[PDB]
Design an enzyme around this catalytic site. Structure first.
Site, mmCIF file in Angstrom:
data_model
loop_
_atom_site.group_PDB
_atom_site.id
_atom_site.type_symbol
_atom_site.label_atom_id
_atom_site.label_comp_id
_atom_site.label_asym_id
_atom_site.label_seq_id
_atom_site.Cartn_x
_atom_site.Cartn_y
_atom_site.Cartn_z
ATOM 1 N N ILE A 99 0.823 -1.200 0.000
ATOM 2 C CA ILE A 99 0.000 0.000 0.000
ATOM 3 C C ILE A 99 0.861 1.256 0.000
ATOM 4 C CG2 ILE A 99 -1.987 -1.191 1.042
ATOM 5 C CD1 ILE A 99 -1.191 0.015 3.706
ATOM 6 N N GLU A 110 5.402 2.549 -0.804
ATOM 7 C CA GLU A 110 6.843 2.505 -0.569
ATOM 8 C C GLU A 110 7.194 3.847 0.061
ATOM 9 O OE1 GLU A 110 4.908 0.453 -2.927
ATOM 10 O OE2 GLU A 110 6.913 -0.438 -2.754
ATOM 11 N N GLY A 111 7.444 3.844 1.364
ATOM 12 C CA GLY A 111 7.819 5.052 2.058
ATOM 13 C C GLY A 111 9.309 5.319 1.991
ATOM 14 N N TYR A 131 11.201 4.716 4.331
ATOM 15 C CA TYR A 131 11.794 3.686 5.164
ATOM 16 C C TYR A 131 11.414 2.288 4.695
ATOM 17 C CZ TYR A 131 12.997 7.516 8.283
ATOM 18 O OH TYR A 131 13.541 8.661 8.813
ATOM 19 N N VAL A 181 9.198 -0.634 2.132
ATOM 20 C CA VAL A 181 7.810 -0.943 1.815
ATOM 21 C C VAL A 181 6.837 -0.972 3.001
ATOM 22 C CG1 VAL A 181 8.243 -1.882 -0.455
ATOM 23 C CG2 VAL A 181 8.371 -3.362 1.590
ATOM 24 N N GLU A 222 -1.510 0.637 13.616
ATOM 25 C CA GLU A 222 -2.948 0.741 13.410
ATOM 26 C C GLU A 222 -3.153 1.071 11.927
ATOM 27 O OE1 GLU A 222 -6.189 4.324 14.268
ATOM 28 O OE2 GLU A 222 -4.137 4.460 14.992
ATOM 29 N N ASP A 249 8.931 15.322 8.515
ATOM 30 C CA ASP A 249 8.606 15.013 7.125
ATOM 31 C C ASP A 249 7.118 14.983 6.822
ATOM 32 O OD1 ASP A 249 9.151 14.456 4.446
ATOM 33 O OD2 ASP A 249 9.139 12.286 4.781
ATOM 34 N N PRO A 291 1.044 15.190 2.601
ATOM 35 C CA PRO A 291 -0.327 14.666 2.559
ATOM 36 C C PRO A 291 -0.412 13.132 2.688
ATOM 37 C CG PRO A 291 -0.085 16.430 0.945
ATOM 38 C CD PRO A 291 1.256 16.273 1.603
HETATM 39 N N1 LIG Z 1 -5.286 3.883 -0.534
HETATM 40 S S1 LIG Z 1 -4.481 5.164 -0.008
HETATM 41 O O1 LIG Z 1 -3.647 5.633 -1.084
HETATM 42 O O2 LIG Z 1 -5.441 6.068 0.579
HETATM 43 C C1 LIG Z 1 -3.414 4.630 1.294
HETATM 44 C C2 LIG Z 1 -2.105 4.268 1.008
HETATM 45 C C3 LIG Z 1 -1.273 3.861 2.028
HETATM 46 C C4 LIG Z 1 -1.741 3.801 3.342
HETATM 47 N N2 LIG Z 1 -0.894 3.376 4.377
HETATM 48 C C5 LIG Z 1 -1.128 3.201 5.745
HETATM 49 C C6 LIG Z 1 -2.339 2.761 6.261
HETATM 50 N N3 LIG Z 1 -2.537 2.598 7.572
HETATM 51 C C7 LIG Z 1 -1.503 2.875 8.370
HETATM 52 C C8 LIG Z 1 -0.304 3.303 7.841
HETATM 53 CL CL1 LIG Z 1 1.022 3.661 8.900
HETATM 54 N N4 LIG Z 1 -0.082 3.482 6.538
HETATM 55 C C9 LIG Z 1 -3.060 4.156 3.613
HETATM 56 C C10 LIG Z 1 -3.891 4.566 2.593
#
Ligand SMILES: NS(=O)(=O)c1ccc(Nc2cncc(Cl)n2)cc1
Length: 276
Positions: A10, A12-13, A15, A17, A72, A118, A121
């Site tokens: 979901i 690649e940050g 830090y 994947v 979470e 950092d 959005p």
């Molecule tokens: N589908 S979206 O682009 O809105 C999206 C993408 C990545 C994440 N990542 C996430 C979700 N929950 C917790 C954390 Cl730390 N990261 C969420 C939505």
């Protein structure tokens, strides 16, 4: 880890994947971050900085000499919701609510001398209840767009004021539906800031000319009026935005004083309409 099962990538940050995963015991759905002794200890300190506008760090797993962070899980980030809302824009009462909750998260983290460093959005997570949460926080212990001018000018010992600047950039962006300072290198980022806000000087920012990467050859641009920058934002909101976009980091408003700004007098908590 074996105790988990990736449902999907979901992100690649910075830090490494990020995965949506399920805990095979708890059955809980979590965000799973794979990283890539001080990092270990500072991490596990982060597990205690808990608040409603801070994505919860569920678990820190140091195994096979790797480091997974279990968070979470939230379904949507603000970048995505902003694109989804590009045709009419996020409604102001919902911009205002989001801004107010974020300033609470900031106020809370800043009171523990923890900074984000950092903000952007995609680090801003939303839910169906009309909450917004800050994710990734405290872990700097590609986008330049939200970077404070003191970071750009080579300040190594910068403050909480840096997060206030990023959030000011994200506030403007929600209102106008364009990025405020979409730089594509460091000098272009800096010069975009200068062109809107005026080349800073010793008058507005004592000490600026002494910073590591300040050059006297900087072009000198005149400042623009905010009415031009974030229309059709009202004078309350613009006022608040200008105090968040102060050059001097010591002049820049704190998350806490910003909470008491008149902009927030009529704040409510609306609920967004999300397609998950
Ligand atoms: N589908 S979206 O682009 O809105 C999206 C993408 C990545 C994440 N990542 C996430 C979700 N929950 C917790 C954390 Cl730390 N990261 C969420 C939505």
């Amino acid at each position: 880890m074996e105790n988990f099962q990736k449902v999907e990538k979901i992100g690649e940050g910075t830090y490494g994947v990020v995965y949506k995963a399920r805990n095979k015991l708890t059955g809980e759905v979590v965000a799973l971050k794979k990283i890539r002794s001080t990092a270990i200890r500072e991490i596990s300190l982060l597990k205690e900085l808990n608040h409603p506008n801070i994505v919860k760090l569920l678990d820190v797993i140091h195994t096979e000499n790797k480091l997974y962070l279990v968070f979470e899980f939230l379904h949507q980030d603000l970048k995505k919701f902003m694109d989804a809302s590009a045709l009419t824009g996020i409604p102001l009462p919902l911009i205002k609510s989001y801004l107010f909750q974020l300033l609470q998260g900031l106020a809370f983290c800043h009171s523990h001398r923890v900074l984000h460093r950092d903000l952007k959005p995609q680090n801003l997570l939303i839910n169906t209840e009309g909450a917004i949460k800050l994710a990734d926080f405290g872990l700097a212990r590609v986008t330049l767009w939200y970077r404070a001018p003191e970071i750009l000018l080579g300040c190594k010992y910068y403050s909480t004021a840096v997060d206030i600047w990023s959030l000011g950039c994200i506030f403007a962006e929600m209102v106008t539906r364009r990025a405020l300072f979409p730089g594509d290198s460091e000098i272009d980022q800096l010069f975009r800031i200068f062109r809107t806000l005026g080349t800073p000087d010793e008058v507005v920012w004592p000490g600026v000319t002494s910073m590591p990467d300040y050059k006297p050859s900087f072009p000198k641009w005149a400042r623009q009026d905010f009415s031009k920058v974030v229309p059709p934002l009202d004078e309350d909101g613009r006022s608040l935005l200008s105090q968040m976009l102060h050059y001097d980091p010591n002049k820049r408003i704190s998350a806490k004083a910003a909470l008491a700004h008149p902009f927030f007098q009529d704040v409510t908590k609306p609920v967004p309409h999300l397609r998950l």
